[PDB]
Ligand binder design. Sequence first.
Ligand SMILES: CCCCCCCCCCCCCCCCCC(=O)N[C@@H](CO)[C@H](O)/C=C/CCCCCCCCCCCCCNc1ccc([N+](=O)[O-])c2nonc12
Ligand SMILES: CC/C=C\C/C=C/C/C=C/C/C=C\C/C=C\CCCCOC[C@H](COP(=O)(O)OCCN)OC(=O)CCCCCCCCCCCCCCCCC
Ligand SMILES: CC/C=C\C/C=C/C/C=C/C/C=C\C/C=C\CCCCOC[C@H](COP(=O)(O)OCCN)OC(=O)CCCCCCCCCCCCCCCCC
Lengths: 642, 642
Amino acid sequence: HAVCVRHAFKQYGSKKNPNHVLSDLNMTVAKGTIYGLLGASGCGKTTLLSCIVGRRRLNTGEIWVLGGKPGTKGSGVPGKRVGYMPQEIALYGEFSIKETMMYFGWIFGMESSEINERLQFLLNFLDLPSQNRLVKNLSGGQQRRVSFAVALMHDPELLILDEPTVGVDPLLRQSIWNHLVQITKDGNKTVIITTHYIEEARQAHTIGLMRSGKLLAEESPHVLLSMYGCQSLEEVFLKLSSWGKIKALLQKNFLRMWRNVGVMLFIFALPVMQVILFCLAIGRDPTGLKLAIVNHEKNYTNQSYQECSFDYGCKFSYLSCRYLNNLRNSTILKEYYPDPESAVDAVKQGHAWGALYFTENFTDALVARMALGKDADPETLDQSEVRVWLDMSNQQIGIILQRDLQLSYQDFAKDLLGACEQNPDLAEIPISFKEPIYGSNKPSFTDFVAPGVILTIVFFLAVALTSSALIIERMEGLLDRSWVAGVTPGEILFSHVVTQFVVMCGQTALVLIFMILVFGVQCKGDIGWVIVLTILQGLCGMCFGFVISAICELERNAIQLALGSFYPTLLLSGVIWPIEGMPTVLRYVSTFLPLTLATTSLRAMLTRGWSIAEPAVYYGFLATIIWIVAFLTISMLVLRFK
Amino acid sequence: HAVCVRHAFKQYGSKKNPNHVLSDLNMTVAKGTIYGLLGASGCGKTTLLSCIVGRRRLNTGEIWVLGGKPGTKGSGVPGKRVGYMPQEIALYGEFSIKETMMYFGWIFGMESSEINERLQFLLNFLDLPSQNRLVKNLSGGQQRRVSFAVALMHDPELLILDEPTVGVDPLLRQSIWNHLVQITKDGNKTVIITTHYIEEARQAHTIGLMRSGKLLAEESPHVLLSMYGCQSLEEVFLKLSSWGKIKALLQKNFLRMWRNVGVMLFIFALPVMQVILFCLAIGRDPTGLKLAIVNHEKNYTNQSYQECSFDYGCKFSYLSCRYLNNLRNSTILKEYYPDPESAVDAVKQGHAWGALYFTENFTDALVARMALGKDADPETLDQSEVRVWLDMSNQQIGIILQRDLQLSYQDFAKDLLGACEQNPDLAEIPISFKEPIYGSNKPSFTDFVAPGVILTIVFFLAVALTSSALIIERMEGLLDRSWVAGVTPGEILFSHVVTQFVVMCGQTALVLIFMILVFGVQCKGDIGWVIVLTILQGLCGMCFGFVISAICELERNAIQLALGSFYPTLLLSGVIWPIEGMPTVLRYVSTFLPLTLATTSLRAMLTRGWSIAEPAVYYGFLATIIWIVAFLTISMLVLRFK
Ligand SMILES: CCCCCCCCCCCCCCCCCC(=O)N[C@@H](CO)[C@H](O)/C=C/CCCCCCCCCCCCCNc1ccc([N+](=O)[O-])c2nonc12
Ligand SMILES: CC/C=C\C/C=C/C/C=C/C/C=C\C/C=C\CCCCOC[C@H](COP(=O)(O)OCCN)OC(=O)CCCCCCCCCCCCCCCCC
Ligand SMILES: CC/C=C\C/C=C/C/C=C/C/C=C\C/C=C\CCCCOC[C@H](COP(=O)(O)OCCN)OC(=O)CCCCCCCCCCCCCCCCC
């Protein structure tokens, strides 16, 4: 007996809306015959076929297919001994017909010599175009013909065809039925055809009519016609009551990316462009700021000329052009106005960032202030000071202008004394800053954000790749077709991890080369542990794509959940601002987030050179390991009940 | 004479590898009969039906349906004079059956009173569940029946049914065919039914067999059988040789998103949550910074207690506990260590950010330095100074620590004199900063990024909503089904712009309220023009969704195209860092980007209170207007050659 289903029962949904898809179903399929299964809808037959192949399980009843229970190692129901043609075209695009044949033959263990003979025979028999034509370039009928040829290549002892000829040319239909008759006759082969056609399954040696989840009758066609006395079948029906699989899967995964230029540009040319733009735009010091200078010790000539001239040695000739000489040249441009009212007006518009206004007696009052110290009259204290009106609406620019205007006075003051043979240490505030313990006196903001950009690119470009791949592959029956072919779920998962591991290693090479070698972001720590931490974040990101793909069933719902969690964690992990800004209550919560302790750990490796032994460094390695385990437990728990 | 087709030549390709989908094709449909079209594949017949309806145009020949050419004057072919049932289920999910019938009835202009009678009749006739059940909750065999009911409800004079009986129970197929032969009984009605199943189109009055893009024979079924002598048709086919339509579309647009809890949360609850997290974590000043104080003038008791006391009046008792009282209590936490080389070990680890180290001779050396002047010996200048070893690996924390330590010395110095009846102005550097022209002396970074975050949320929440809505509709056949109902593309586009405009107004109100009324972000300028500019950036975002949806056809390629331009534009529009830091060549390129000049214009209206008359303000209005027109032009050119 090819198949024996006895007292099959099946339920769907919850108790609120029970669905008795199968109820007390009996079925028998002998060896060497064709068994047509004609049903009204398209659900009971598909559910029965899924129970036969082993995908589903019966609530009550018994099944004996090919010798033993489906998928129990007592028989080879999922494997080379069965031939499956799904209702949908569960084929791979971007695959030539020859490549599809090779992939499935390797999955079935066929040698490459016989695959070519079978391919040539099937191409000659099924009226198909050249083997090199990609499947995505074919029409619906040719795609269905290729899907039918896939189920015939390994010569199984049980064929399960789901509407094999729905719109096939009538001559081709006749040839197909003749071939099925030839292979099934006087042999061990069996065919089980499921169709909505009532009038095509006349050549089936036994017909089973489905209704209300049970077989109304099951007899030979002409026997049914004679016994019920009807001219055609419709009148009778019109009654009022293991390394070869992994190698095959590895060459499929990499070839599914090479034929998508959009995918390669998104996961290999976007990080390179993102890193280039970040290192050129973020963190650098502003370097074009303009200042309106009103020097009343010199005559006004132009808005771009002042003839600031003085004597370098001594005698303190001007001291207003001498201060402006020490001003830093890279970030401040000098503009000249003849009136403090005319210079403040420029600031009130977008023509300057500040005003200076040296008074006409700046020199005399400044010398009389240093010489007569600790008892200077209020008149001197008012005529010897520079009056700066600043535009402090921008925080970072206001910081630079205040820093560069007070720092230039220190150099100016260290030049006045020292040119008259005095020590320059007399012009220093008692608060003296010694050599920094870490870093330097001129830090950069792009060194603070660089650790956060590296981890965010790797983490969230693996959530996108895994969720998209495992969802579009599951929705078109590609996973269910290869499961019947004999590919265990462990082998499906192993190949995805290896493929994703290699991809994330290429991204790590590109991101770290451009950040460090080209744009000169310092790495004072161990380069070996930076590579390990970046990769561990990629695996943690990949494990989050398992959660998303186990919850969401549509692409549009997965991207909302991926983007709905990428934004909040970016603003709480301290990538673009120090973690010390948040309140104490909000600082506790942010620590437990996936990327918070990993960004802190990477920032200490690069900016301070700390090793793995430091508590602040290995806390970012233990935090990723916990989240890898947590993301796997949640994903496994979701699949348990759903 | 309903449909006449003469010499209908239609071809697909680019004149290099042409596909002849149609050839010399003559076809006449007599009024008052049932016509079956029984081709093999599913593309030639579908192409012919699309030409008949009016969707497409031919290359040669004439098409004459119901009086005149389709889609032109002289006929009502696209409208209420035809009834179209597509090959795919083109129904709306999240719609009850009653709501679907009301929607399609309003499209055809029938009164809501007589829609009920048709609904009840069709419900009873087609054996369907209660009208309150959602379409998505129906099975696959009931959605086809609902589609058939939709195609039959307004009582047209020409029914074009595309395989209405795929998985229908025979007891219902008989009733459907009886209804079909009953309505078209010596009347004005015609049915054009196209099937792959030859045996079921026997009841049709006329049959046209299609092959290779032409009709092999077109005669009565019994005449076809008799003239060739065959018993069934299978052997014979073996031939080796406006208001009301806009109102209806607005209800459907506002009900599609109200019935999707995921969509409501993404576009209404995520912008609110994003604004809260940004205003609580980004831009604020660090607060818990710890310092390691070494004070050799006092005894050492604990790591948290030092018993610092002095005399407030005069005589300068300790002057090292006096300076520490002026330290800012908010940002600096004081810790005490016994040795100068022991507190540096705390900084080397993560237990502090700096060290202070007041010497044991600090009080006597400081009072002997300020009381001497310019003649202090080098020994005194070394014993009267505080030595700070800072951790400058963090740029932002390094600024606060240096600013607070230098500022506290000014308040300390301004307190020494003033308590001894001296002029406090004596303790000032000549560089004196007057009152800022714009802003205050303590600017906030979150005020710099807030104007850039408002525009980014609104712009990219419209690219997401517009691209997804217009891609799901087109790929599911819903756009084409309503076009045959008479809904002009002008009314589809007008009702979409209205739907998005109302949504972007609600988003603007939520973002502006949670930013200004709560969290107190300053708004100096006019609030009337802040709302206008924010909405104008929303319309530019929607127009970018037209370009994406007209270029991409799959869901996943629009996601990558949208994200592939979101990230590069964020790093070039000066949202998170001043645009003055970028190199000059990159600065010129960035000003032409969609969001650059708009962010600058909104920042000036918020932080300085500038009006529309300032060039820096209305340049952001001009750039948004120009990019709106450019985006609309690009979408039209793409739709021309595609
Ligand atoms: C995917 C996961 C990750 C993707 C790869 C990640 C690349 C690597 C990481 C890059 C980081 C490096 C530099 C970061 C520094 C940036 C500073 C910042 O972070 N700024 C902050 C603040 O400070 C920033 O301004 C605030 C920002 C957020 C703004 C909101 C934008 C939301 C939309 C984004 C674009 C559209 C995407 C299309 C999805 C369509 N969806 C839908 C489908 C179907 C339906 N339907 O069914 O209709 C829909 N309905 O609605 N939507 C529907
Ligand atoms: C970085 C990691 C951070 C944290 C780690 C982890 C925590 C654990 C993972 C936790 C995720 C949590 C809950 C997911 C649950 C259940 C979804 C699956 C059930 C059904 O929800 C349907 C589809 C999917 O159902 P689907 O199969 O596709 O539809 C049927 C198709 N025929 O869900 C969707 O769209 C969700 C769309 C998310 C919108 C993103 C913006 C969110 C803004 C803030 C949200 C505010 C919440 C307020 C609560 C209001 C309650 C009414
Ligand atoms: C904010 C404003 C920004 C800029 C202002 C703009 C002015 C113009 C905007 C122009 C953008 C438009 C069209 C671009 C062109 C053409 C795409 C559509 C044609 C055909 O591409 C097929 C499908 C579409 O076909 P599909 O529907 O998916 O398949 C159907 C199968 N039958 O496109 C896709 O793969 C989208 C996947 C995008 C990948 C993102 C990568 C981001 C980093 C790129 C790095 C540098 C790239 C260098 C180019 C090298 C070329 C080898």
